[PDB]
From a paper:
Botulinum neurotoxins (BoNTs) are bacterial toxins produced predominantly by Clostridium botulinum. BoNT/B, /G, and /DC instead bind to either Synaptotagmin I or II (SytI or SytII).
The change from two hydrophobic proline residues to two polar residues (Ser and Asn) is likely to result in a significant change in binding affinity as both of these residues are found neighboring the conserved and central Phe residues of Syt, known to be key elements of the hydrophobic binding mechanism. In BoNT/B2, this loss of hydrophobic interaction is replaced by electrostatic contacts between S1117 and N1197 and the peptide backbone of hSytI. Here we observed that both N1197, via its hydrogen bond with F47, and Y1199 contribute to shifting the N-terminal part of the hSytI backbone slightly further away (1Å) compared to its position when bound to B1. In BoNT/B2 however, substitution of a negative (Glu) to a positive (Lys) side chain at position 1191 likely decreases the affinity of B2 for its receptor. Although the backbone of the hSytI peptide occupies a position similar to the one when bound to B1, we identified several amino acid substitutions that cause a loss of hydrophobic interactions between B2 and Syt, thus affecting the overall affinity for the receptor. In B2, the presence of Y1199 is not enough to compensate for the loss of affinity resulting from substitutions P1117S, P1197N, and E1191K.
Numbering used by the authors:
A (entry chain BBB): 39 to 52
B (entry chain AAA): 861 to 914, 924 to 1149, 1158 to 1227, 1232 to 1245, 1252 to 1291
The structure:
């Protein structure tokens, strides 16, 4: 759940 | 500035005269008191304070006046009510309120009356005054009666027409007029001086009475732990924080405003954006170490800063409460501004300084996001401290004095 949010956070950082 | 004749202050769960002249002070059962010197006047029969005192005089106090009910705007604008009355033989002074106006009145022995008032707008996106603690000072000599608000001169009228004014009358703190049962007034630090205070004296009193051990909320009340707060940015007043749909970043949207027709009133909504909560008495003070949390559905989430931070500014991480070596979680709440304010700042630390929480334009076309920023670290050291900086935040709880 935290992992799936962290990825989405990484996608935004692009 | 010991030129004070009456100094009503909290002591041993009671309001008393700390002037050294020892006026008799009777607080009736319907007045609410706290150790932060606040007292509430309600519509109840027994909500009054009665002061038995033992032309050149001044009156100071703070006040927090409820926002108008949207449905009852006409009563608000028309109906005047006294809050403090000092009369003997039909002669003296009274402080009254009519909607968004606070009114000072002098009456002489022959019943001759002159009044001066301060009117704050009810059409402002964000008001400094509505339902917020502000400072009132009223000075009087032989010539002029004038009102100062937060140390600044606002109103002034000539009173040489007025005869003898008996001002040693018994002082009654009480709501009097055409009032709703719902009506109330908060007040603190009521003082009388036996001189016309200068502007210089009032700036000094404003700055003294502005200080407290603890940080304050949007309304000017003490900032608390374990309490739900909407978040306000002093640099981007008309913006708020919303969690991006099914994501882990905070996008910044523009506040909605009043919808109904009535063109007497305009404001931006305050009870919008995520409901935040500050974690570790339950009082928040300078240099305290906190966790900034918010509720996502019915689960308490956290604001984290990504430890890999080569750029000057970066988007914050909004996720479930979980210890990760990839993310900073410990925030230190700050108060850099030397001048009166309800604003505070939020500093991520490791004891180095990583960056301050604020708002910034990130490219994707551009959009605003809830961010950490290294830029703010230099700006906060510049003097005078800029109060419209993006790193300046305020917490808004629900208050009975603001219904939208």
């Amino acid at each position: 759940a935290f992992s799936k949010l962290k990825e989405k956070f990484m996608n935004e950082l692009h | 500035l010991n030129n004070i004749i009456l100094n009503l202050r909290y002591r041993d769960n009671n309001l008393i005269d700390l002037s050294g002249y020892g006026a008799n002070v009777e607080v009736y059962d319907g007045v609410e008191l706290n150790d932060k010197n606040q007292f509430k006047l309600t519509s109840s029969t027994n909500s009054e304070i009665r002061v038995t005192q033992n032309l050149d005089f001044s009156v100071s106090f703070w006040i927090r006046i409820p926002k108008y009910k949207n449905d009852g705007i006409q009563n608000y604008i028309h109906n005047e009510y006294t809050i403090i009355n000092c009369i003997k033989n039909n002669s003296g002074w009274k402080i009254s309120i009519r909607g968004n106006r606070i009114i000072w009145t002098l009456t002489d022995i022959n019943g001759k009356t002159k009044s001066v008032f301060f009117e704050y707008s009810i059409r402002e996106d964000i008001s400094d005054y509505i339902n917020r603690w502000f400072f009132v000072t009223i000075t009087n000599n032989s010539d002029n009666a004038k009102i100062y608000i937060n140390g600044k001169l606002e109103s002034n009228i000539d009173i040489k027409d007025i005869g003898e004014v008996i001002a040693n009358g018994e002082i009654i703190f009480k709501l009097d007029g055409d009032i709703d049962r719902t009506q109330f007034i908060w007040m603190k630090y009521f003082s009388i001086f036996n001189t016309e205070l200068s502007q210089s004296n009032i700036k000094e009193i404003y700055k003294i009475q502005s200080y407290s051990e603890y940080l304050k909320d949007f309304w000017g009340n003490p900032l608390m732990y374990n309490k739900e707060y909407y978040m306000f940015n002093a640099g981007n007043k008309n913006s708020y924080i919303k969690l991006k749909k099914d994501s882990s970043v905070g996008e910044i949207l523009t506040r909605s405003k009043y919808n109904q027709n009535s063109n007497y009133i305009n404001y931006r909504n305050l009870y919008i954006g995520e409901k935040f909560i500050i974690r570790r008495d339950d009082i928040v003070r300078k240099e305290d170490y906190i966790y900034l949390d918010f509720f996502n559905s019915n689960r308490e989430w956290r604001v984290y800063a990504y430890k890999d931070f080569k750029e000057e500014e970066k988007k914050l991480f909004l996720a479930n409460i979980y210890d990760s070596n990839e993310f900073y979680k410990t925030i230190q709440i700050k108060e850099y501004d030397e001048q009166p304010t309800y604003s505070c700042q939020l500093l991520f630390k490791k004891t180095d300084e990583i960056g301050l929480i604020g708002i910034h334009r990130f490219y994707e076309d551009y959009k605003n996001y809830f961010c950490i920023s290294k830029w703010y670290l230099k700006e906060v050291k510049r003097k005078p401290y800029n109060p419209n900086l993006g790193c300046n935040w305020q917490f808004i709880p629900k208050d009975e004095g603001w219904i939208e």
